[model samples]
Target: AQNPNCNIMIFHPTKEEFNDFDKYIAYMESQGAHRAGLAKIIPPKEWKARETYDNISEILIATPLQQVASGRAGVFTQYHKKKKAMTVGEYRHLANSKKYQTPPHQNFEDLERKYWKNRIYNSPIYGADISGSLFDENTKQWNLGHLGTIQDLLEKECGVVIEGVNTPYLYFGMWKTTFAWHTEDMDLYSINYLHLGEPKTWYVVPPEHGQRLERLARELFPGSSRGCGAFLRHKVALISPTVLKENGIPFNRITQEAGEFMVTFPYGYHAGFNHGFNCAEAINFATPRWIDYGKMASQCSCGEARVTFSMDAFVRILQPERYDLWKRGQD
Candidate 1:
């Protein structure tokens, strides 16, 4: 058995961004995105509204309030915003960008079709909903500093750190495909760690071996049916408990009863659905990836990198079909 305390760590002073709530609030008033806009985004006006001040505080600190603040401040939201939503024309336009591209393993459109066609997803889902801040400096913009501060807070309060990434984002999109089990793309290592309170479980399979697992899942659980969105989460969480088993990668379970543990997602294929029962109070990070040098994972012209489970050696193959996965759904 794993020691429950194994995941807990003493948060050093250097990482304590919210040491005092009042002080943090003061910082927020001064530095948060937009004070008035933020206030409008919190509580019950939005989707899953926070009920108490404590809940409000927790949500603000956990997810970037900027997402909601953006909507309230005449920005865009996946729900009511028109400019933000990808239209069919644009999706098709981007989809056709790689007319003659080639891929290493699978074609881009094949990957996209395989994923988008999968029937295991829920509808009316939010796509890539996450929050973060813009940086400021005495004389100019400082994106790194602003993002770094949040990353530090995540490490301090949550107990894990992600290096070389910024622009925190989250997606609540549907999981509507048959091959949603894992990924084989290795252009860059991706990590996903979720928070569902209490014992938030996470299951991760690395990009290298994930295809095999995904194949196994499809073969064993083959079915073509429709189900409620919330219920799908339940069934998926049960069958694929490995994704939420809280082990390596992004799902580290806190080991201490008195101390809270923050899960760190270093790298791997991660997926999970959280429950409130017998779990700890938890909030998740859609932390930014400050280092993704303007490279869209789907359209890197350098080609798709292959991971062979070898230590730091791989090949890149350019394929157009794979880019189909890059398209946003017209629906």
Candidate 2:
């Protein structure tokens, strides 16, 4: 399916098309679209979130939370306060706590590893937030369990049709980490889109680069698992401002309205940070709900799938020639 030696290529789509675009046309070349993998940007945006949202509704979209929705009773429920709730500041600190680095609960690591690894199904550990829960600003207190979709919070602030991943995991924070960087295992049809503010990120390889990324991380940082996931892939990478210049990789300047495809190499090192507050969002298609793909691709169940999180990386991944064209035409 992919070059055995090369890492993943980040497919940073325009904001307009980021939300939709079939996995094949965007990432892998398919029979449905022409010039699929690489292309330059053109006038006027072609894809729309509303259109994609509607298309997704036609199919049954499910989440890992559904597995516990029935028994937990609290998994899908929300806390609506009469007036106010905690500030983002407080939540941020808790998310950065060392407690999370340890097991979420007593022996949680053991349980999580045992059930999923050995194929032990129907375990409570795989269910709701029994170990702990995330706070909900809307209700002013904590929900009994994980709030599967943080997209719900983003929408509360910006009410618009948005496509994204809503999980219990705290990504992009100081103490945050991912279980793995492997591509979503739903038949390689899931298209991934990423956006970022503040600092940049490096988008890397696909399906096979997992082990290599993990191996390289050890040599670079020794004890740090920060880079210890399956990230290097056949994809685009968002190199941070600080690291990019330090590493001496020259990058062309770009703007929000620019068009053109950016070139990125698999396994390229990239990273970034935001001096001001920032928000990074990525949307993916072809991803199945926790219960959606059973029998075969069950390995993706642990919410270990990788999605985009860097806007700078997103824009930079665009095709360079198209980007120049867009830049020339911009007002």
Candidate 3:
């Protein structure tokens, strides 16, 4: 059984609060939303899905996280051995087969195909520089590159365009395909905007439980996770909530619907699988609160050494932005 003692927090911010995103987010964390590892924000009624999307009409070349043909008890592979260069228009048709997708409310031992089908998942087209194509690119929160998103302080200050972080990356998620549990690349905050599709079921462990998860992963994978601080980041583990409950770890469940915003806090471990065929976009960002965690994650990423951008380069922008605000206050 999953933990029954805790519940995930959901906030419905007013237009004023939503517009002042930086303050509102800080306030949300101030209210202890980050203790849930992730929060779901239901934007006001008028926030319809933004209009322009380059992916639905462009070629998407990437590898999907293919499910292991053998089983799904506690197995997830970070990537498939092959890459599929396909387009969204057709990928949509391929992924929309609900009969072949996972059906939760069914017999556990019945037809395995319908219960655990659709091997290809998380096909992403990154670094597309497609933000200019969004209709309301000026005000939409999904446009992390814009000032309206408020103090992202990720790619902007560091002078780089990292797809899926500063730049938007269109993700194609099919049912049963998993995103393994891990924190953000640099232990920064992350936001996911479901473009238009079925819900995504997110399993998150609060930053408070972040290390508890690390302990479990290290114990499970002994040598692999022993020396490495980022052992959970391999994106290959999928311990069930029932199992975690047995192991004394609590998790908050979130079902992120279309047009909803799912925000992840720094160092909060999260992973999830799609409900059905869906297209979502996500970006990694940083705020004043993130610097501490980023500095900590910088010293210990020992599992897989991958660099999206120079996180230390952020050192250049922090002092000036802080002083500018400090000077304004003094004035």
Q: Put down candidate 2 lDDT per residue, 1-331, tens digits, no spaces.
A: 3433343233445555443323324343322111111122222254321222112112111111111111121111111112122233432343335542223334433433332232112211111111111233342211212222434432443353345553322112221111122233221222111122222222333222334434543443343334323222211122222332454433222221112222222212222211112222222222222112211221211122233442112222223333343233221
For model 2, state the Cα shift of residue 78 in Å: 30
Error of 1 at 40 (Å): 34
Q: Which candidate gets the maximum lDDT versus the true structure?
A: 3
lDDT (Cα atoms) of all candidates against the true structure: 0.26, 0.26, 0.61
The reply for model 1, stretches above 4 Å from the true place, is 1-145, 148-166, 169-197, 206-208, 223-267, 275-321, 324-331
TM-score, model 2 to reference = 0.28
TM-score, one value per model: 0.30, 0.28, 0.75
Residue 252 of model 2: what lDDT?
Answer: 25
Candidate 2 lDDT:
0.26
Point to the candidate with the largest TM-score: 3
Over 1-331, each residue of candidate 1 has an lDDT whose tens digit, in order, gives 2222222122322234533422433343343211111111011112121222222112222221111111111111111222244532332232224421112225433433332232122222222333432112331211222322433543554465534233433322222211122222322323222212222233344323433443444433344112221111112322333322322222222122212232222123344322111112222222333113112222222222221222111111122354343221110
lDDT of 1 at 98: 44
Report the backbone clash tally of model 1.
40
Predicted structure 3: lDDT: 0.61
